[PDB]
C-alpha cells in the first residue's frame, strides 16, 4: 500500500560468554511493522547468522521526512537477482518524499520490466543536493528556467449520460 519508512534494530539474543551484542540497524520501506520486521530478518539472514528464534528486535520506529513539502530529486540504486547473476540499476525520480519515490519506482518497475516486489531490492535512496549532478534527461527536462507547458487535450469528466453541447476540449 502507501509505504512508510521504518527504523528497525536487532540484537541477536544474548548468551553467557557474550552479553550485549552488536545491535544491527536497518531502514525499511513497507506498509506496516509486520512486513518491516519480516524484511529485516530476511536481510539479516543474508548478511549474518541470525534467526527470528535466535534473535530479537529492539526498537521499531517510524521515520518521517524532515521536509515533506520541499521538492527533491532522488537517485535510487536498485538490484534484482535476475536472470543472470545480480545486476544493478540507477534511476532518478523527482518527488517530495522517499516514500513517494519508492512507490512510483515499484509501479514503474512492475510496468516496464514485469519485475515484482518479491524480486526487487532497495539499496539506497538519496536526495541530490546540487543541480548538475542530475544525470537522466527526463529529470533534466524539468529543471529549466521559468518552465511552462500547456495541457492541450482537456477531456471533461461527465456525470450524465447525455449532453446537449457538442463539447469542446480547449484550454
Amino acid at each position: 500500500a502507501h509505504f512508510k519508512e521504518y527504523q528497525v534494530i536487532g540484537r541477536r539474543l544474548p548468551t553467557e560468554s557474550v552479553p550485549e551484542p552488536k545491535l544491527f540497524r536497518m531502514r525499511i520501506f513497507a506498509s506496516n511493522e509486520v512486513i518491516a520486521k519480516s524484511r529485516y530478518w530476511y536481510f539479516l539472514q543474508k548478511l549474518h547468522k541470525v534467526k527470528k528464534a535466535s534473535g530479537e528486535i529492539v526498537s521499531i520506529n517510524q521515520i518521517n521526512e524532515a521536509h515533506p513539502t520541499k521538492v527533491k530529486n532522488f537517485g535510487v540504486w536498485v538490484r534484482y537477482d535476475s536472470r543472470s547473476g545480480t545486476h544493478n540499476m540507477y534511476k532518478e525520480i523527482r518527488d517530495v518524499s522517499r516514500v513517494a519515490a519508492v512507490e512510483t519506482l515499484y509501479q514503474d518497475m512492475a510496468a516496464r520490466h514485469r519485475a515484482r516486489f518479491r524480486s526487487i531490492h532497495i539499496l539506497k535512496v538519496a536526495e541530490i543536493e546540487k543541480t548538475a549532478d542530475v544525470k537522466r534527461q527526463y529529470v533534466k527536462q524539468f529543471l529549466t528556467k521559468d518552465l511552462k507547458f500547456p495541457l492541450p487535450h482537456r477531456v471533461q469528466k461527465s456525470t450524465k449520460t447525455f449532453s446537449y453541447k457538442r463539447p469542446s476540449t480547449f484550454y
Binding site: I9, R11, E20, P21, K22, L23, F24, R25, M26, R27, F43, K46, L47, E56, V58, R79, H121, L123, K124
Partner: protein, 124 residues
C-alpha cells in the same frame, strides 16, 4: 573393556540392549538393538530382561536372558529422579510453587543500553 564387568545389575534396574561385535557369544535379537528393558532375575553369566513387544495392536511381554557384555545402564530416568528429589526439597521448603515443569515461556521486558555499542547500520 573391563569396566563392562564390574557392573552390578539388581532386579528392577532399566538397561538398553546394545550388543558389541567383539564377543561372538550371545549376540541377541537382530532388532532388539537400542531397546530398553528392566531386569527380572539374574544368575551367573547372565542377566534377565523383559520387553513389551507389540504384535497386532497389543503389547505382549517377552522375557529374555542376556550376557552382561551387551547390556548397558540406561540414563532414561536421570532427570526424573533429579526432579523428584528437588521436588521433595521444594515441598519441604513450602511446608516451612510450581515444582511442575513448564515449557519455554515468552521472554519478559528489559532494557538495552548504548554505552560503547552504538547500533551499526548497514544494507545488502
Amino acid at each position: 573393556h573391563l569396566s563392562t564387568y564390574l557392573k552390578v545389575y539388581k532386579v528392577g534396574d532399566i538397561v538398553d540392549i546394545k550388543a558389541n561385535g567383539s564377543i561372538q557369544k550371545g549376540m541377541p535379537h537382530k532388532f532388539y538393538q537400542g531397546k530398553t528393558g528392566v531386569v527380572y532375575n539374574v544368575t551367573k553369566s547372565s542377566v534377565g530382561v523383559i520387553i513389551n513387544k507389540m504384535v497386532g495392536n497389543r503389547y505382549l511381554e517377552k522375557r529374555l536372558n542376556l550376557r552382561v557384555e551387551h547390556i548397558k545402564h540406561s540414563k532414561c530416568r536421570q532427570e526424573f529422579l533429579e526432579r523428584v528429589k528437588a521436588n521433595a526439597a521444594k515441598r519441604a521448603e513450602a511446608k516451612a510453587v510450581q515444582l511442575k515443569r513448564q515449557p519455554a515461556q515468552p521472554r519478559e521486558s528489559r532494557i538495552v543500553s548504548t554505552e560503547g555499542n552504538v547500533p551499526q547500520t548497514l544494507a545488502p
